[PDB]
Amino acid sequence: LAQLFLQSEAAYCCVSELEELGKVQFRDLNPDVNVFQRKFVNEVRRCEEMDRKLRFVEKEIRKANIPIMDTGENPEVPFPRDMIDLEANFEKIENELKEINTNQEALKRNFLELTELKFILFVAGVINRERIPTFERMLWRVCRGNVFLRQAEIENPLEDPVTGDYVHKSVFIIFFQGDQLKNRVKKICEGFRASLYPCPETPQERKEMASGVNTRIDDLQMVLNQTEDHRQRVLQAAAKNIRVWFIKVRKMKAIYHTLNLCNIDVTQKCLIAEVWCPVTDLDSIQFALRRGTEHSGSTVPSILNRMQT
Amino acid sequence: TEFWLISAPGEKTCQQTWEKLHAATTKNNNLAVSSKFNIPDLKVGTLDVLVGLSDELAKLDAFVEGVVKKVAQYMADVLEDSKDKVQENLLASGVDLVTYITRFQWDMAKYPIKQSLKNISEIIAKGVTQIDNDLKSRASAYNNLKGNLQNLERKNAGSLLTRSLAEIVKKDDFVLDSEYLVTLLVVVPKLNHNDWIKQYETLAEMVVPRSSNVLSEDQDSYLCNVTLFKKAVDDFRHKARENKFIVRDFQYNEEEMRADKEEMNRLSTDKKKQFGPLVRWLKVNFSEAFIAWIHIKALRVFVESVLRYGLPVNFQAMLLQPNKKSVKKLREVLHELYKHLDSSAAQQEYYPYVYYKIDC
Amino acid sequence: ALSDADVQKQIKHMMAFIEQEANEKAEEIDAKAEEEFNIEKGRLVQTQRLKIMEYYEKKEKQIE
Amino acid sequence: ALSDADVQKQIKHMMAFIEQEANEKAEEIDAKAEEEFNIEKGRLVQTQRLKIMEYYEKKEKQIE
Amino acid sequence: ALSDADVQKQIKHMMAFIEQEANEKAEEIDAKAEEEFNIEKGRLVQTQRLKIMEYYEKKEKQIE
Amino acid sequence: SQSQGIQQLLQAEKRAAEKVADARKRKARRLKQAKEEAQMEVEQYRREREQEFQSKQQAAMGSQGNL
Amino acid sequence: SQSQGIQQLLQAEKRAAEKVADARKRKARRLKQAKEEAQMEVEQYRREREQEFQSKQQAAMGSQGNL
Amino acid sequence: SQSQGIQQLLQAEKRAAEKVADARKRKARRLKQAKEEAQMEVEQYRREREQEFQSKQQAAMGSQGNL
């Protein structure tokens, strides 16, 4: 057991270099002090937020089958203060991605919703013919089939939005002139597994509206396709930087956590710590310390002196 | 007592007889009793009004059915012309329910046929509503009278330990107009009657010896009166209690006993006087409730028949009086006879024809 | 639940309801038309008869 | 449990009570009568003596 | 990797660091003291100089 | 045979429209007749009161000279 | 013997009532006598003061006379 | 040797604290001196402007004399 005193600016760099060397184990000089008391909490908290957010995006990356090879850059683990802004930049990217997917899902609903109308043009809606055998009978139960039903069958039906998958669709829906019974049918249609919300017209104008719908559908799909394309390009590009980032962030966290396990002096911006280290490797440690503090602009001697124990 | 009410599409005139007379095809091979159902020919507008009316009638039906059965129970509680084991129902149209239903007629007097159904329904609904409120109020007032009368009977019930003394104590039982003396009544169990007679004379200082006598007796104790000096009453009643005799908290009071006697006599007479008008009131209300009840069912028949078969409104409606254990056969017959019209529109209620039950 | 013959039957039934509704509505329209006939005729004729009477009274006042 | 002699003793005892209360009441009433006699005599005699003295004093004013 | 002579040398260098900071900090403090000196001096000088000028001018105007 | 039923429904709607439009035409016609007759009565009322006025005015001239 | 008991007690009550009524009668009489005696003393006082007044009145008139 | 390093750093920190607190004390003293000197300079300005007034007044008196 030996004790080292050096300036805190030099200390950040030195700890980083020693962590890269990996031959020294630091002891906690303040065992009765919690993380808020150690005052690395803001740095750790930021690291933890960065980590979780990175992992969040990582899940999307992995689902997207991005190679994330993690073969370089990361090993150098630089730890400038500007990394905090880089952390924020990460948060922005994943947040953008989160908005895009949310938008896509809404777009998907609209796509499907318009697609159903496209198909329709009561109503020739989208039904799996789950309860239609009973829908008709329920109608007969409310009134004796006062109006004929419209029948249709969809070849290669569209993927039902609630289902999330593609099922054959078949429609048999009744229209009524009576208001009491129309309201009754409304209630049945709401209760039964049927697609009902068509806004029919018989005028040529409605066929023209249906054409406008097709146009809008195409525009929606175009925008969707571009959104997804951007998403994927961004995800893979981020996957490259994320493999590097993961380890960079982990290293920073480890460094700050190690520095918490220390006793910060009160009167000077200098840090004293006791560490265990191999005797034979002490020279190697001092050379690492020299390089670390040399990177630090203050070039504090950073002398590690053996204690008796 | 359940009757079945059904209606067929009536496409052919044979339906009039197929539901009654066609022994080859009719109910239990013409063994169930059937009769013609008299229906008014009323105006219908569009199908949605009919739909409304159907819903309304179903609700009115349930309401009145409840009301007429409730009032029937009210009369059962009265115990006049209707009991729970005999006389299960009251007369309707001045005839028995079996007679009424069997020869049921439409009451055009209440529901003119020149009116729209909406108005007919509203009129019936109003009638049965008024009847309901009239009899509810009357029954409540009567029940309150019955309550008070029973309360008085109970007050004047029990043994001498607790029974009111209104019918027991006479002026000649108390020592009245004394300056020093008061007469107390104490209940001594019969087993200790002689002990009381022997002991009462020595229970307290300054009591009048040999004054004790017996006012009343029952299966457990004797009620005896003793005259004593006012100030010894505390010692008297204390020591009497010590010897296991119970003193009643009673003093002679002519006005309270007379008031109790007349109040009971009055309430009993009032019970009789209301009973008189009670049975006439309730029986008339029943008659009208039952007539309206079946009228409602007839309208439910009209509405469903038109709603299912369209117009013109010519349907063959018939009543059955089911025979015991033949329900299955009748349903099988009716199904085979009429299933071809609906095949699936009509278990718990859906049959391929208009069908209602009458619960009597 | 229906064969073609029964679908046709159901349609005939609807048509029947359409016809009954129209017949009733027209009857209602004509009845109200007659009520309004008498009401408006009264309003107008009484209104102007009144105006005339008032002017007449004015002529009598001028004679006075 | 009590003989004719004892029931008569009890009756005499009650009568003795009644007589004792009667005597105490009559004596108390007579004593109060004596007190009220003197009280009313004082009230009356002083009231009118005062009136007499006042009229006398008025006589002095008349002499003046 | 350092001898006692070298450890003591580094301790001396670290003390030199402390002395250097002490000097730099004190110099900064004295510089600020001088800045505050000149700032407050100016404020006071101008404030009262202006008041004197105003009295002079008022008297001169009064003479005219 | 679905198109036949649908066509029949359309025919029913057409007939309904005819029934109602003709009822509206009849309402309008009866009301116009009512107005024409009312005005005729109004004119008669005017003619008669005017005649009465002129008669009284002429009598008044006879009274004035007499007076 | 319930009636003999009460007979004796009601007769005792009668005697008590007579005794207290007589005491009240005595009170009433004594109070009247008390008022009569008070009034007699009032008259004695009246006579005495009236006599002094009349005595002084005659003396005063003679005195007024000589002056 | 760390316990000695500790003692040396504590002594250096003691001196540093003393040097800075002393600078703050000096700052307060210099500020007071600044106010005292300012007031003396203000008086010097007052004296000079009063002398200028007197000069102006004498010139004015001679000018009024000549008019």
From Swiss-Prot, chain A:
Stretches in topological domain Cytoplasmic: 1-309
Subcellular location: Cytoplasmic vesicle, Clathrin-coated vesicle membrane; Cytoplasmic vesicle, Secretory vesicle, Synaptic vesicle membrane; Melanosome
Domain of life: Eukaryota
Residues annotated with Phosphothreonine modification: T202
Signal peptide: none
Family of the protein in this entry: Belongs to the V-ATPase 116 kDa subunit family.
Task of the protein: Subunit of the V0 complex of vacuolar(H+)-ATPase (V-ATPase), a multisubunit enzyme composed of a peripheral complex (V1) that hydrolyzes ATP and a membrane integral complex (V0) that translocates protons. V-ATPase is responsible for the acidification of various organelles, such as lysosomes, endosomes, the trans-Golgi network, and secretory granules, including synaptic vesicles. In certain cell types, can be exported to the plasma membrane, where it is involved in the acidification of the extracellular environment. Required for assembly and activity of the vacuolar ATPase.
Subunit-level organization: V-ATPase is a heteromultimeric enzyme made up of two complexes: the ATP-hydrolytic V1 complex and the proton translocation V0 complex. The V1 complex consists of three catalytic AB heterodimers that form a heterohexamer, three peripheral stalks each consisting of EG heterodimers, one central rotor including subunits D and F, and the regulatory subunits C and H. The proton translocation complex V0 consists of the proton transport subunit a, a ring of proteolipid subunits c9c'', rotary subunit d, subunits e and f, and the accessory subunits ATP6AP1/Ac45 and ATP6AP2/PRR. Interacts with SPAAR.
Name the UniProt record assigns to this protein: V-type proton ATPase 116 kDa subunit a 1
Species whose genome carries this gene: Rattus norvegicus (Rat)
Full-protein positions shown: 12 to 357 of 838
Curated annotation (Swiss-Prot), chain B:
Main location: membrane
GO biological process, one term: synaptic vesicle lumen acidification
Tagged with keyword Calcium: no
N-acetylthreonine found at: T1
Tissue: Expressed in brain (at protein level).
Top-level taxonomic group: Eukaryota
InterPro entries recorded: ATPase_V1-cplx_csu, Vac_ATP_synth_c_sf
Membrane topology note: Peripheral membrane protein
Pfam families for this protein: V-ATPase_C (PF03223)
GO molecular function: proton-transporting ATPase activity, rotational mechanism
Entry keyword annotation includes Calcium: no
GO cellular component: apical part of cell; ATPase complex; clathrin-coated vesicle membrane; extrinsic component of synaptic vesicle membrane; plasma membrane; proton-transporting V-type ATPase complex; proton-transporting V-type ATPase, V1 domain; vacuolar proton-transporting V-type ATPase, V1 domain
Subcellular location, record wording: Cytoplasmic vesicle, Secretory vesicle, Synaptic vesicle membrane; Cytoplasmic vesicle, Clathrin-coated vesicle membrane
UniProt entry keywords in alphabetical sequence: Acetylation, Cytoplasmic vesicle, Hydrogen ion transport, Ion transport, Membrane, Synapse, Transport
Cystine crosslinks: none
Role noted for this protein: Subunit of the V1 complex of vacuolar(H+)-ATPase (V-ATPase), a multisubunit enzyme composed of a peripheral complex (V1) that hydrolyzes ATP and a membrane integral complex (V0) that translocates protons. V-ATPase is responsible for acidifying and maintaining the pH of intracellular compartments and in some cell types, is targeted to the plasma membrane, where it is responsible for acidifying the extracellular environment. Subunit C is necessary for the assembly of the catalytic sector of the enzyme and is likely to have a specific function in its catalytic activity.
Assigned protein family: Belongs to the V-ATPase C subunit family.
Protein name as annotated: V-type proton ATPase subunit C 1
Curated annotation (Swiss-Prot), chains C, D, E:
Family: Belongs to the V-ATPase E subunit family.
Phosphotyrosine PTM positions: Y55
Subcellular location: Apical cell membrane; Cytoplasmic vesicle, Secretory vesicle, Synaptic vesicle membrane; Cytoplasmic vesicle, Clathrin-coated vesicle membrane
N-acetylalanine modifications at: A1
Function text: Subunit of the V1 complex of vacuolar(H+)-ATPase (V-ATPase), a multisubunit enzyme composed of a peripheral complex (V1) that hydrolyzes ATP and a membrane integral complex (V0) that translocates protons. V-ATPase is responsible for acidifying and maintaining the pH of intracellular compartments and in some cell types, is targeted to the plasma membrane, where it is responsible for acidifying the extracellular environment.
First and last residues shown, out of full length: 2 to 65 of 226
Complexes and interactors: V-ATPase is a heteromultimeric enzyme made up of two complexes: the ATP-hydrolytic V1 complex and the proton translocation V0 complex. The V1 complex consists of three catalytic AB heterodimers that form a heterohexamer, three peripheral stalks each consisting of EG heterodimers, one central rotor including subunits D and F, and the regulatory subunits C and H. The proton translocation complex V0 consists of the proton transport subunit a, a ring of proteolipid subunits c9c'', rotary subunit d, subunits e and f, and the accessory subunits ATP6AP1/Ac45 and ATP6AP2/PRR.
Tissue-level expression: Expressed in brain (at protein level).
Annotated protein name in UniProt: V-type proton ATPase subunit E 1
